[PDB]
Every structure is written in C-alpha cells, then in structure tokens.
Amino acid sequence: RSDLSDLKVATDNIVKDLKKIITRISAVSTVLEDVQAAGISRQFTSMTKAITTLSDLVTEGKSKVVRKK
Amino acid sequence: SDLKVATDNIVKDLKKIITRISAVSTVLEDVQAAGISRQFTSMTKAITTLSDLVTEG
Amino acid sequence: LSDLKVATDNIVKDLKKIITRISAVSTVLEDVQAAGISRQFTSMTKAITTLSDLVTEGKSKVVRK
Amino acid sequence: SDLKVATDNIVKDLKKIITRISAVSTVLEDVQAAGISRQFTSMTKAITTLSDLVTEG
Amino acid sequence: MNSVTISHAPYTITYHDDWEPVMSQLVEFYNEVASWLLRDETSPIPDKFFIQLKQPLRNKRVCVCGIDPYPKDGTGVPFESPNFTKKSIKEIASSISRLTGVIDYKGYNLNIIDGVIPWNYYLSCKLGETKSHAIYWDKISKLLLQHITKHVSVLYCLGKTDFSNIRAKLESPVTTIVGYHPAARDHQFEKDRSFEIINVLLELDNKTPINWAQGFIY
Amino acid sequence: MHHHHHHGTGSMTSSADLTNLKELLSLYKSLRFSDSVAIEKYNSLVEWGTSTYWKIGVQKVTNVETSISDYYDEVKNKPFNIDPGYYIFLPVYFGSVFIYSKGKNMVELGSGNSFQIPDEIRSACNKVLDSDNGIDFLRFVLLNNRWIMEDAISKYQSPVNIFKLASEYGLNIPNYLEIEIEEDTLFDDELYSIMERSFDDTFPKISISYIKLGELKRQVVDFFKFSFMYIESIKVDRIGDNIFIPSVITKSGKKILVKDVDHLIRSKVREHTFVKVKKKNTFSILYDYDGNGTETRGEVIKRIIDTIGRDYYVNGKYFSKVGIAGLKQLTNKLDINECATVDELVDEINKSGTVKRKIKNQSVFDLSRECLGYPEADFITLVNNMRFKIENCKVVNFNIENTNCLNNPSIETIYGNFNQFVSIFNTVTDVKKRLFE
Amino acid sequence: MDVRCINWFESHGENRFLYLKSRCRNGETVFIRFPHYFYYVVTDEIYQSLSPPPFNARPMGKMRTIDIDETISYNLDIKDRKCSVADMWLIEEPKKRSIQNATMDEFFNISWFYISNGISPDGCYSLDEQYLTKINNGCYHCDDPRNCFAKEIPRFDIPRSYLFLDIECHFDKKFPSVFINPISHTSYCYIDLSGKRLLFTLINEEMLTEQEIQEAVDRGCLRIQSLMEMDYERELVLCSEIVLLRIAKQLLELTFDYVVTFNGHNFDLRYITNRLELLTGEKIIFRSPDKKEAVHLCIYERNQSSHKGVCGMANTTFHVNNNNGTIFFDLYSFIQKSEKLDSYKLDSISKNAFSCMGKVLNRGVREMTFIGDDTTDAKGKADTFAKVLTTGNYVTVDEDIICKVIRKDILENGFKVVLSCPTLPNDIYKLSFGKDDIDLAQMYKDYNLNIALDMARYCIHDACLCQYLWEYYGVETKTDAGAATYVLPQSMVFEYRASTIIKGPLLKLLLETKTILVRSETKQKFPYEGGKVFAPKQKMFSNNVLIFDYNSLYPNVCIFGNLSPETLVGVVVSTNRLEEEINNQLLLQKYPPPRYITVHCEPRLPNLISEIAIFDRSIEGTIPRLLRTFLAERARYKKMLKQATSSTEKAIYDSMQYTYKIVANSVYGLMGFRNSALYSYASAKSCTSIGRRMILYLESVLNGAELSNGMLRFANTLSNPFYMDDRDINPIVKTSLPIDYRFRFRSVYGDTDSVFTEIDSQDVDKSIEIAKELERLINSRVLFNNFKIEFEAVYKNLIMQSKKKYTTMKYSASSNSKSVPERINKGTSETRRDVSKFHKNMIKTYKTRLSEMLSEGRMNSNQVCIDILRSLETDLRSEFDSRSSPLELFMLSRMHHSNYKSADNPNMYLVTEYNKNNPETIELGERYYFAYICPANVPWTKKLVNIKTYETIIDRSFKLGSNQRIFYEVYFKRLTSEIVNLLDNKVLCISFFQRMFGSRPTFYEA
DNA sequence: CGCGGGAGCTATGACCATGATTACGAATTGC
DNA sequence: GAATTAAGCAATTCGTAATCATGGTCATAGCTCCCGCG
C-alpha cells in the first residue's frame, strides 16, 4: 500500500512468504502421511473440501499471471 | 480439529497472498511471470501430492 | 552384512526423513500457535523430554573415540 | 488428537532406529561416525527449537 | 575486360563481367544470324556492334532504349553523335536543356552519364533503313534487354509504335517508360517530360536521381 | 490495323502523370504521417503505377504504424550535458498525441484513424498549412477538449513563427522560450523544474522537447521515477458539456492523470490494485503500459463502467453521460440561443444562414447522433442490430432484434438513451420538414 | 451496280483513306475508296464556337445528352439526371483534332463511318456510279457514302477467293530456325474467283540430289526454274527455295478474300517472308487498291493485356499488315479465342473437330476397313470426315491407335478407308484425325524422295486442313454475322473483344434513340455479388432431375428492370437500419412500384448496410432497347433459319443468331466492366440482384411442388417479388396432365440462370412430359413480362460432386427414353484441362460403376467403399509398377500468360526456362502440355515437397529418358482425392489416403 | 557451531523441429 | 512517328508459404543437501 518506488522488494516479500506457506503445506503433507502411517481411523471429507477450495484459490491465482503474449 | 484450524489459517493466509498478488499482478514483468509461475506450479504440484495422498490413503 | 556400507547409507537416509518430519512437526505447531487457538502442550513436552533423553543417550553411544 | 499419535509414531521409529544403531555399533569407523554425530547435532538443534516453541507459551 | 570468340566478321566481343550470363546464348544466336546479317552494309561498323557490352550494368540504374542505330553514320554507341547532325539526339539535347536550363552546349551524349546506359534494341540497322535487321536482332535484343532490365531499375523506351510490345519482349517486370520517339511529329517529344519521370521513378525506387546535365558536351 | 498500336501504351510520359508521380513520391515520403484516406489514395496511385509503368519501387500498404519517431530520437531519463548554442524549448504535453499532416485530416498516432475535429480548429490548421507549404505535419495533443499544438516539425523554418501564426488564427500554443547556453550545463532535475515553471502553463506536461535552430532530428528529454501507488477509486470529472475524463484516485488523494479511456482500459486499472505511474515534481502521470491480467476487453470495459456507474458509456477518448435530452442539447450542439419549441428554433435557423447551411449539408441521423454525443461506429453497430416502426420519418416504436450487441455496456447505455435519441431525432426531422419542405 | 462487301480496311499512313473490298455478281472485285475522317460529336454552341471550321458537319437532330454518373444518395433528395437536349453536329475531320467537351468520343471512326452513312458492313448494295470516281482499274472513290450506299438489295451468293496454306521446315533440333534451316514444303489450297479448288504443293529441290530430282520428275512431279514456268494445276512441283519463296510471295501478294493459315502469322507466313529477305532480299509487297502506297509483310505482335489482378499481358495474337483487302486469317488465334481444348496445335484441333463413327465391314491382319455413313454417326459428320479424308493420311482410332491410310474411297454419303490397324474386337469405333506417328526430326535426317512425297502429303493435308477447319467452324458465315451484328469490318470481327464489338450496335442504338451517354466524374472501384449458385441438397440422385433454364436470363433482367445507366434515377444507400427503413418508406411513396423498380442490392461499401437502385420504366434505356434489339434479331434470324432449305443460307442464319446470342450475353459483362462504354455498376449489380431474385423465386415455387390429382400445387404464393402485379398469385394451378400422377418436386440445385428440380419419378418419358407441362405452366403463370424459361434436359443419375461440378446423362426435350443417353459433364475433371487423361478415364469408369450400383438398387456404402478402394488400390499399384500407359495419357496442360502478382512464380519461370533453353517459343495465351518428371532412381514417395518445381513442359520433340520418369504419385493423389470426395464415409477414406500418400485428404462440405 | 563452495536433482520457460491449418494465388469451368 | 482495348462473379482444386498446435531439447533458476574450513 501507499507508495512503492520499486515493486521488486515487495515481490521478494511475496516470494519468500509463499515459500513459507509451501513449507507449512509440505509440513502438513508429511505429518498427515505420518498420521496415516500411524493407523488411526480418520474421516477426511472436510479435508477434501478444504483442498478443493485451496485448488480453486490457486487456480484463481494462476489464471492471470502464468501466460504472457 | 488441529488440522482443521491448520488448513483454515493456511486458507486465510493464502487468500491474503492472493489478494496482494491480485493487487500487484496487473503490472508484473516477464521474468517475474516466469519465476512466480514456476513457484505456483511447484505449489500446485504440492497440493496434487496432497490430493493423491488423501485420496489413496 | 559385509563392509557396513549399506547400513551406514540406511542410517544416513532415514535420519534425513526423521529431521524433515520433526521440522514439519515444529512448523505445523508454529502454524497452529499462529492460528490464535488456545492449546496445551503437557504430553508433547513429556514426549519431547523423553525423546531428548533417548537421543542424548544415542549421541553418547555413537561416539567414534 | 493427532499430533500426539504422530509424535508417538516418531518415537517408535526413533526406537527402531536407536535399537538398530545399537546393534550395528560394535564397529562404526570414524568418518561415518562423525557424520552421524553431526546429524545428531542437527537432531538436538531441531529438538531445542521445538522445545523453545513448546515452552514459549 | 572479357572476350569470347566469334566465327563471323567482328571476330571478337568485348564484354564486362556482369554481361557474362547472356554471352553463351548471345554467341549462339549471333553465330546463326551473322552469316546473313553481314551481307548488308550495316549503319554501325560490325566491329562497333557491341560497344555497350563494355559498360557495367550495376552502376546503371536507368536505360535509354532506342529501337535501332541511326541509319546513316552509325557510331555504335546509341544516341552518340560527334557531328551532332542527328535529329533524335538534338531533341534529347533540347529536352535535357529544358530540364536544366543549360542552353550553351556543343553536343549531347547519353553514354557519359552516370547511371544511364543508352541502348539500341536492334543493335544494327541497314544504311538508310529503319528496323531492317529486326529479324536478326529479335532474340538477341530480347535476351540483352532482359539482362539490362534484370540489372537496371527503370527502362526508358524511345518509341511508341516500336516499343509497344515491351512487356512481352521482357520476361521480368521492370519499370518501363514507353516514351515518344524524339523524331516524332506533332511535337509530342517536345510536349512530354519523360526525363523528369525517370528521376521521379528512380527516387521512388530509393535510387540516386540522374544528373542529366552530365550528358552535355561543351 | 497498326493505326491502333500493337499493344497500346497510355500518356504516362505526359506532364500530368509526372505531377501525379510527384504527388505519389510526396505522399510516400509522408506515408507514416498521413491518415487512412491518403493511405488508400497512395494504394490506388501505386496500383496506377503498376498499371502504367509495369513496376513501382514502392508497394501497396495495408497497415501502417503511425510513428513520427523518425523525426525524433530516443528519450533519456538521466541528467546529461548539453552542447553550447541557440536552443528553443517546447514542453511535451500529457494527452493523446495527434498529427495534422498534408492530407488535411487529423491523424492519430498508434492507430492511424482520422479524428473528428471542430470546424474552427480545422480552418485554423488549414490556414496554417496554406500559409506555409514547408510544414510536414502539425503535432497536436488532445486532453480535456482542448486541441493544443505541441510542436510544428518542419525542415526549413523554425517553429517559433509558426507558433506565432498559430496564435494568430486562434490555435492554442504553449509558451515558447529561446534560452541560449554558454557552457556544458548539466540538464538536471532542478533546471528542468525551473524550465517547466518558466513555461508557466497550467496544462499537464510530461516532458520537454528542445529545438535546434539549424539541426533536425529533435530530441525529447524526460525525467520521472517509476512508482507503484495503491488505488482507492476511479472518479470522473467534467471537461465538457456532456463528456467526462477518467481520473484515478489513490488512498492519499493524489490525482493520477489518465490520458483517455483507451489509456485506462489498455493498462487494465482495477480497483484496489497497484498501477504503474511516472512520478513528477507536481503531477502524477500514468505509464503507457499494457495490463497483464486475463480479463478481456469487453469485461474490463464492463467492470470500469460498473465501478463508475451504469449510466456511462465509452465515447472514443472520453466517457459520457446519459439522461433526459430535449431541445437544449440540440441548441448547444447548434451553438445558438435557447429554445422552448420547434417553431422558434426553425425561425432562428432561418435567420442564421451558416446554421441553415450546416443543417442542409448534414443528414438528420448524423445531426441527431452528434446531438447526444454518440460514437460513430458503436451507434451504427447498435442501430444495425435492431428494427424500427416508422411513420412520417418518425420512430413511433422500436424493438431490439439482436441481444448479442448488449454485452458491450456502451451499446447498452446508448440503447437505454435511445428513447431520448428518438425524441431528438423526431425534433430534427420536424425541423428539416419545416425548412426544406 | 450490285456489290457484296468482302472487307473494309484502312490506308497505312500518308493520306488516311478507308477502302472497301467488294464483289459483284459476275465475280469482278470492286474497290471503293472513302476519305476516312475523325468523327466528333459536339453540341450546336460548341460547333459554332470552333475557331477552325469543320471539314464536314451533318445535322444530327435534337439528341439528349445524359450524365451517367452513379452518385450514391443517403436520402431521397435525389437530383434529376442531367439531360440536355441540343442540336448536334458530326465533325468529320481528316486529321485528329482535340475538341473540348466533345461527346461520344468512345466510339470508333469506322463505326461512325458505318452508322452515319447507313452502311451495314455485311450488306449488298446497289451503288450509284455518279458518286463513284474511278481511280484505276477496279478501284473507285466515293465522296458521298450517304446517297451512294442507299439501296440495300438482299443477299446474293459470291465467288469468294481463298488461299489455305501450311508450310514444313527442315529441323534437326526441336524447332526450325529461319536463318539456318531451309523450307522443305509449301502447300496451298488455291480457291480462285472461278471456284477451281487447286491443291498444289511445292517441293524444295535443294534438299534432293539430282538423280533424286529426275526420279521425282519421272514419278510425275514437274520441275521449274522460275516463276513463269510455275503451274498451279499440278499438285507436286519441284523448285529451288528461292523460286519456292517467289511463288509464296506471288501467292500472298494476290488479292484473295481470305488467306488462312494455321499458326501461320506466328510461324508459317513469318518464316516465308523472313526467308524471302534472306535468300533473295525480296519482300511480300502489299499494294493499296488505288496503288498509292505499298507496304511489306511484317508480322506485328498484338498482345492483349488482362484486366484482372496485376493487369499483366494475357494473350498474344499475330497478324499481317496488309492493305490490299485480304483477310489474312490465323486459325490458331481464332480457335484459341473460341474453343476450349487441351492443346491448340493442329493435331488435337483436327482430333476434336473431325471425329466420326466408323463401323467395320472387313477385318485383316494389318489392313482394317472402316465404313462410316449416316447410320453410324449424325448427319453430315461422315461427309465431313470424307472431306477431310480426301487429303488425309493418318486416322487415329479410339483415341489411342494411330493408323496410316493405305487406300481411301469417297462414298456418296460417307467414306471408305482401310487402315494400318491391328485386329480389334468391337464393331463401332471412333475415327478421328489425331496425332501422327512419325518422328519428323529423324525423318528429315535420312531425307529421301519417299520421305519428301510423304511429308508433301502431310503438308497438303495441313493446308487443306485449314480449309476443313474453316468450313467446320463456319468462319465465313461467322465473319459476315459479326460484321453485320457488331458493325465492324470483316477483318476486325474476331480480333476485338466485347467492348469494341458492342460499340457498333450501341452507336446504332444511340442514333435511333437520340441519346448521348457521358461520364464526367472518374470511375471508381467496387466489387459486387454475381449470381446465386445454390448448394446441391443431395450429393447423389437416383431420381430424374429436371433442368429449367431461363431463356437468356440477364438480357431479360435488363429489359424487364430497365437497367440502363441513364434510367438509373439514383442509388439510395444507408449506413444504418433506421435510415434504411426511412428510405424504404420514402421509396414506397416517392417512386411507385409500376413505373419504378426498387432493386435491393448488396452494399458497395462496408459501412453501408443497404443499397437500393431505382430505375425509371416510363421510357426504356440503352441497355434494354439494345438487348431487345439483340433478342428480337436473334429470334428473327432463328425464324429465317427455320424457313431456310439450302445449307449455305442455313449456315449464314445460324451464324447470325449465334452472333446475336454472343453479343446479347456480352451486354451483361460489359456493364460490370469498368472501362467499357456500357459501364454501369448500379445497373450491373441490379442485374445480378434481380437475376438472383428470379432464381430464388423459381426455386422457391419449385421447392416442395406437388403435382396431385392432375393439379399443380406450388408451395409458396405466386407473387411477383419486385412489385405487386395484376396477374394471378394462386399457387394451385390446373394442368393438362392425367389425374393419376402424384409426384413431388424438389429444387435441389440452382445455377446462375438454371434451376435444377428433382422429380421423384424415375421414368424418362413421363418426366419429360410432366416437365414440358411444368415449363408451359411456369411461362404462363409463374413468370411474368419477358421472363421465359426453356426446358433443357432431364438429368438421369445426376452426380454432383459440389457446386458447378456435376456429371450426368442428357435427356433433352426433343429426346425420349428410346434415344441413346448423351454424356453431359460440367465442371468436373473431364472438362478440366489441368487433369490428365488417365485421371479422366478412371473417374469416368468409376463414376459409371457407382452409377451402376445406384441403378441396381439400394445397397450399403461401406461395402462399395471397400471394393472401390480395393479396385483403386489394385489399379494404381499396377499403373505404378507396370507403367504400361503411355506419356500422352499422363500429360497436363496450362495457358501461359504474364498476369502474375508475383514475379517469381514457378509457372512464369518455367515457361521462361523453356523459351530460353528450347527453340520453341511459347507465346502469351499459348497452351502448353506439361507433365511431372522426377528421376527414376527415387523410390515411391509419400510426402510431397516442391511439386511445382517438378513441372516440365512437354512438346512433340520431347521423349521420356531412361533415367527420368513420370511423377505418378501426384496423379494418384489428385485422382484418389476425387474418388474419396464422391464416397460417403470419411473414416475408411482417410485411412486409405494416409496409407497410400501419408496426408490428410481434403473433403468437400455440402 | 556457522556459512561458503560445490554437486546434483528438478521442474520450467525459451527455443527449435515437425506436422497440421489456413490465407493466397493460379488454373479452370460455369452461367 | 503515332494511332488504344481490356466481359462480371461463384466456386472448386492444387500447390506454396506464413502461422500455429504439439512435442522434444536445452539453458536456467530454484533449491536442497553434502562436505568442508575456520
């Protein structure tokens, strides 16, 4: 917000912050693999809805930044 | 419901990320489009592995 | 088991997955602490202390001397 | 109800790893022993950081 | 610069390096037309048939094409008259003097101008006859003018009836000007401004305009 | 039958075809400068040249990029030392760049379309071109309904006396200052700021062009900083009787100037998103960049109208208003005094000979289209997709046939205002009936 | 003094004179010299404003001058057309005079001589000898062509003189050169004023040895040494080449009515005059009838530049600069202009022309006897074949086998000839005069006296073949018909295209109607829409298809709509629909539908949405009165053809009605042509629009037409589309047919002027009777004013590949079911000249096989697709492996021109490489045989790159080398594409085309 | 213990090759 | 020496060349860990 003389520092911020949230989501990936290997019974329909919402959000993010010319 | 609120604040923080990249994404350069398309495709590979791991088990 | 190369390769490649998973546990715990929900970490502290005792015993028993 | 059984499975896998290192440890030889010792320094650094995150409140 | 053998009376054709790709066919046609051509007393000297082959074609950008040499006292260079008794070169000198304003001239020569190759279509004519050796020089003229129009940019033809078929006589499209003959009646060569058109068409092809005052002989 | 030639050739050696070829050469040398009409004339004349002389050095053109950058040079954003000598300084203005070449139409840079200009500006430009033949073109700037001559690029003469003549026939000009220098003064930001201050024009300038006395290929010099300011809203401002300018507004309140509607929509300005601007000392100037979003042309126009308001439509370079429209809009487009009915209007048109001649020459549909300020091709596209019920040259009932035109929101806004268009068109048919029948 | 006009011709410079070659009843040739003037038309005030007085000025009466300018109007405030009636004068000028504002300057001075003096160029005239001033023997001067050429006596027969010739030249290379190769043979057909048809051939004695010369003398061929010893009565005469060329010069200097030679101006007469300048220096001197001027024979190359695209040079015709009145006629140029054949050399022209059916009565081991008469072929075809066989030497049998004639007997109504032919099974074969199975270069290489006499026979066959092609095409009757109709000199009839041949009768029309058409503004460019070609609704028809063709549709369109440039009231255009509806309402009120017709056309500009042209029908214009004159005179000459008994008068009237048909069809095309004197973009576009509307109207009434209970029910209301008409609009129409007929009519296809109606019946005679009923019912009720359809044919098993491409059998109105089917092929590969004869033959046989499956019954297309693909696969592999079919069957053709947008077109470069390498010069408009040639060492190729670089032009001297081969793969690709376009299912066809050539085949979409 | 050198995986945009699409022009017929 | 003509478009097929879908390959940034030297 306000004024940015160069955008590129905020671009470095969003690259590092999105790297952080990739580390979070890989962490929950390989600990959900851990609790699946533990053998406890779970119901992950709400997780399926949550990753469907996440997929819709990341396709909305990718639909207007990926293709040039 | 620890994973529920975990996926909840990942959804919230990622939606904040989507809003700020929507604010800045009108004016992105070419090598920026290349790098952030690479980074986004890595993240969608991560959620594809998530979908496979929670579908197969 | 001859020349102990396969056993050393196994105990190198497994502990990288182990440190990846315990860094994942720390990362998701930081995430759920940043959620704002109140949580209690008594049994987690007990498990962390006993695995710290076991890994210090392993470090004392793995010395080359 | 899931992180405690996750770290319980971590403790069980570490028990298996510790028992097999104790089985092979009649001979180790110095370079891989020093490598495993530096891996154990990384182990206790990760454990120290997670202990800080559970004692910070 | 280059020479090839000829079985007939000129016995030698001197040509420039850019005149090379038509010379085998020109010798082939001349070796069948010359045995019948050299019976008639030609208005140019038979050793002066191919003077214009000694001129390069890359520096030329416009070609002034006549249908034949002058029927009397043929120099062998088209529109060249040291005596300056020919009416056609007098009208060329009059039109270029109307272009430049230079009225104090002794004679005119289209050969000495940079970028201008004066050309006779039929390279020879009989003494006192017009278009006499047309059947001898037909395919030779088609070949040589096709080479010129492959090289030069603008073709200027000094005849309306004579050069009416000039698009048929040339296989490649070239900027062609079928102008009026200088000796034509009703003063149509006095009326037209074809050398101005030559200059304008050369600046349309991004070429250097012709200094027409170079051709005056003082 | 050789009284008819073997293959007859025309009088292409004559002086009339010489003058036609010289016109071809002069129009080819100004091919990028000319409009579409002179480009079509050039294509027809190249076709004539191929028909007569069997080959022409130039070729027929289909699309020509309208750029006068051959008479300009690459712009620099660094401070630079200047050579000693005489220098004339002309400001370069923010608005859309237009040129008035020798084809007597108003050529637009980047598209080549001929723009419609008022009659007094057209007459002043014609008098300027007829007074001095050596002018290649007249560079103009369109912003806020003011046609101002940014520069007058010519080969032989200076633009100073040309600008003096443009002041004489009524064309608006910037202040010209002939300031000479002695040493190699570094043209920094402070000297540029004091030069813009000494220009003393309230109109927005983007850069400064310095003019040599005897040297062509003139240079523009621009100092700016690329900035990215967050956007609060897009607000419209009144610059005419009916039309509006876009003006995009930040959180702090700094007014970022927008060149036109096409400049706003080609950069894809979205609410609460960052934009690329050229930061100046006083004003804020939006950069001439292209947006990188996936949103299409019709959808970005639709959302810009939806943010501004559904009673707005795109009219060329400027937005416009719809509403009630009676006799006063026809009055102000007829530049005469106010009317209450048809009878006083037709009597004072009978008093005004020039207004009556303009009514006679212009068609009724064109007059009623210019009354409400409609775009030309967009309104033709709207009318060409719908049917009418007509009695005595009056649209007593109209219905729309093709719904597919209504996805464009400008067409939908003109269709909403078509009732007022029908009322004004019935008024102008009544006027043309009581004058010439 | 009774004369009949032979030719009109002008003096070659100096004093400009116009001469008339004319023939009396006793056969004495009469020359009349006229002072040829530059005629100009000015008004009265311009005529008095002339500072130099005119040489002559005849009062032309009050003639209206109308400004024919197509100015578009965006409203109905249209100013009236600028009609200015003034006294007008014919400014006859001996020299060319530039007169400001002089009207009617588009017309020829020869046409102005014709119309103003009342002279028809094909007319018999009783001359008043007081106006004739004698110059010398046989030549007169007429200073007053009005009163002298006033009595038009009817036509009388004349003894026309002729010189049909052809020459042979020696050659060791591909083509002879003039300077190094002597002339071997000059044959002539000397038809003089007495009718004594002399066929004599000159033998070159310099190509024979002395003992060979005396052997030729002992064989009966007399030998001469000069001109005075020459006798035209003996058929074979030996001489030196100088004496031969002096005989040629003496014959060409004779004032024949027609010297006719096939490819003669380009090759034969040019070679004669050039070799005459070579060996002796003499010149063929053409002298004027008054003998003031004398010109030499110089073949001037006349090139016809095209008018489309780059306007490049399209055709080249060669002519003779004679001023003695002889119509030096090149048959090569004439049949190039008229006929559409693959090659225009004399062998193919004689093969197409003189084709006859010959039955076999006697068969031998090598001598096979053919008999042709009126039973074998049509009437007059066998007599024509006997006439050609009188001097003929070789007969081509069944398009493939060329046979030398051993003995020829001329019957009373046919021919009897034995042929050097193998024994053949069938009884009836096609006999034609095709190619000649000799190798003329080797035949000249080993040249002896038997060779000399055989090519003397071939040379006299070619010289008489000029006569047989002259009489076959009716060129004297077509010449007289073009002279009378186009109002041109008889030499000028075929040498001019549509604009000059319309400028004569338009001049007639403008002087009867007292009308002047002027164009003050420049003529700008628009494209427009032509006729509406409908999509064929079914690709195949097992049922009969009725052909209802309009009787000269676009002339009836112009006469009906008054579509002339001056009757155009205005062009109403609209950029928007609202102005379009305002203009529609104001067109309904302002211009009433009976007096004015509103033609809704396409927009001429992309911003316009409508364009309506208004035509005043209170008085008729130039185009309708000209076309009414053309159609009335064509009907009149067809009526006199019906009341003619002699074959000569029948030929004259048939050529008259044909020439009027050609000029009436030409009036359409000259309205759309920008530079024509008939140009009117609004009238031409309205002509196409009204003709399209009539096509839609006739298709719409015939779509779903049901003939039930002896009553015809049209589906749509029988309304005149242009205006409300007084005639009945009831669609249910009484017939004159039996009640039991319950048949459905479906308009499946529609041409520019033809509507194809498919009746569900399959009986032929029933379809013909019902269709004649439909034709008369349509002409009585459906159509209106001058619009009449003529029923052309019943199409049995009509096979339509696409639009304008169909193959069918003809069952005409005169024909019946008992008559033999006649093959009409339109637009497909048999008429295509870019298609090899192998492709034509196989598409004919396979289309006949698919016609046979359609005639046998309803059976599935998958199995038939399979068996046609198997048979095609077998035939194409057998053709690729065996190569049994000859070079001629795989040989394409192309017309050479210079109308090319790209200068580096491989067609232009290919013909340039041929003319640069090979001694044969291909002119502009020449049709050259080409084939696809690659070296034989390459294998079978699936993919194709650089196909047009494989083009090589094939001539008569070309032989296929051992290392070279024909590229058969592109022939199989084109042929297989044409098979699979006819086939139904795409899936097997794409698989076959990919397994055979490895590409995706293009399929037509209906 | 802490960060640099280096080496290897790993997608990923830019670029090149191949083949299918389509405008584009000539040839040709039709009416 | 010069001197003018010159039929319209609809529609199909075949070859050529510019353009683009698809796919292979190659630099290339990320990026992640192994080893290491102080």
Side-chain angles (χ1 to χ4, degrees), chain F residues 18-231:
Chain F
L18 162 67
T19 52
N20 207 3
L21 266 183
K22 282 187 171 176
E23 162 182 336
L24 173 62
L25 171 73
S26 296
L27 162 53
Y28 167 63
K29 291 169 140 36
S30 65
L31 182 58
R32 44 190 64 255
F33 299 162
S34 45
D35 56 339
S36 44
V37 172
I39 275 168
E40 183 157 71
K41 169 67 176 181
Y42 162 79
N43 294 7
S44 294
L45 200 49
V46 165
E47 181 78 20
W48 164 86
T50 57
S51 310
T52 57
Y53 298 101
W54 193 29
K55 186 183 183 179
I56 197 54
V58 303
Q59 283 94 30
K60 281 217 281 294
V61 296
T62 300
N63 48 294
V64 177
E65 155 188 333
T66 302
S67 177
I68 62 170
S69 54
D70 288 333
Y71 286 179
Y72 279 81
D73 186 74
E74 300 215 9
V75 65
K76 57 183 73 66
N77 57 4
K78 274 192 221 273
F80 77 108
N81 300 302
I82 208 162
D83 293 331
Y86 281 168
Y87 278 93
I88 319 169
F89 272 56
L90 277 296
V92 169
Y93 282 104
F94 167 61
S96 298
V97 194
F98 287 79
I99 48 169
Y100 194 81
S101 58
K102 314 154 272 293
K104 294 304 188 65
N105 283 6
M106 188 66 204
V107 191
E108 177 189 353
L109 274 78
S111 74
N113 299 55
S114 176
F115 205 84
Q116 293 82 17
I117 56 176
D119 291 331
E120 59 268 14
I121 297 169
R122 187 153 273 267
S123 181
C125 289
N126 289 1
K127 286 166 180 182
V128 160
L129 278 196
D130 290 354
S131 180
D132 188 19
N133 181 347
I135 297 169
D136 278 357
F137 56 94
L138 299 171
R139 168 196 264 262
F140 268 73
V141 164
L142 189 49
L143 78 165
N144 306 329
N145 290 321
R146 285 191 31 62
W147 283 94
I148 62 171
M149 185 180 288
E150 181 172 275
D151 205 357
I153 295 94
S154 178
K155 173 193 174 182
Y156 296 91
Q157 67 274 14
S158 296
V160 164
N161 51 356
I162 305 303
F163 268 48
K164 205 271 190 203
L165 299 186
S167 66
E168 293 179 353
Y169 311 91
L171 282 178
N172 296 115
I173 50 154
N175 291 319
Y176 61 99
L177 293 175
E178 289 189 358
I179 293 184
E180 68 268 14
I181 208 63
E182 183 58 61
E183 69 266 15
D184 300 1
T185 305
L186 175 83
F187 200 77
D188 58 356
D189 288 330
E190 281 88 308
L191 172 56
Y192 174 100
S193 296
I194 201 169
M195 187 68 228
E196 175 161 49
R197 151 198 179 182
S198 65
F199 280 137
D200 209 2
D201 285 353
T202 67
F203 313 130
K205 331 163 193 62
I206 185 175
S207 65
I208 295 177
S209 86
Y210 59 93
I211 301 299
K212 273 76 69 177
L213 188 74
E215 183 179 0
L216 282 72
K217 208 198 174 186
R218 61 191 67 189
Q219 278 74 21
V220 290
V221 55
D222 189 358
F223 313 131
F224 79 90
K225 182 193 53 64
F226 275 128
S227 178
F228 298 87
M229 321 155 68
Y230 201 73
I231 297 301

Side-chain angles (χ1 to χ4, degrees), chain G residues 753 806 831 833 893 897 900-901 927 1000:
Chain G
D753 49 352
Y806 54 88
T831 74
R833 282 176 296 184
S893 64
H897 51 88
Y900 292 130
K901 177 186 173 185
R927 271 208 84 85
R1000 207 164 190 173

Side-chain angles (χ1 to χ4, degrees), chain B residues 3-49:
Chain B
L3 292 184
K4 173 57 79 153
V5 300
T7 314
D8 214 330
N9 64 7
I10 300 299
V11 159
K12 181 196 69 142
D13 291 331
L14 196 59
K15 196 159 48 202
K16 188 200 299 213
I17 288 304
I18 293 299
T19 53
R20 195 170 101 101
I21 70 157
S22 297
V24 309
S25 64
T26 300
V27 70
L28 290 190
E29 310 257 10
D30 189 359
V31 64
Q32 182 153 199
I36 204 64
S37 174
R38 166 176 175 88
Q39 185 63 256
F40 263 110
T41 43
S42 64
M43 192 175 48
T44 193
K45 192 52 162 141
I47 68 170
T48 309
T49 53

Side-chain angles (χ1 to χ4, degrees), chain F residues 2-3 5 8-10:
Chain F
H2 65 279
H3 314 87
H5 284 283
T9 50

Side-chain angles (χ1 to χ4, degrees), chain E residues 25 28-29 32-33 36 39 129 132 135-136 139 143 146 164-169 171-173, chain G residues 173 177 179-180 274-275 277-279 283 300-303 311 313 316 898 903 908 912 916-917 924:
Chain E
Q25 298 167 354
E28 183 178 1
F29 297 149
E32 81 201 70
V33 299
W36 301 98
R39 314 161 321 180
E129 281 196 300
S132 62
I135 62 170
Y136 303 113
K139 51 192 175 303
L143 165 80
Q146 267 157 6
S164 57
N165 300 320
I166 200 60
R167 319 221 191 162
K169 292 161 179 178
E171 58 89 20
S172 178
Chain G
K173 58 193 309 181
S177 179
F179 317 100
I180 52 185
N274 287 356
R275 197 83 186 183
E277 321 175 20
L278 293 171
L279 321 174
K283 289 175 153 298
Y300 53 93
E301 168 184 0
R302 175 178 182 267
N303 306 286
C311 282
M313 266 191 180
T316 288
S898 286
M908 201 46 207
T912 311
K916 183 64 69 178
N917 294 318
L924 301 160

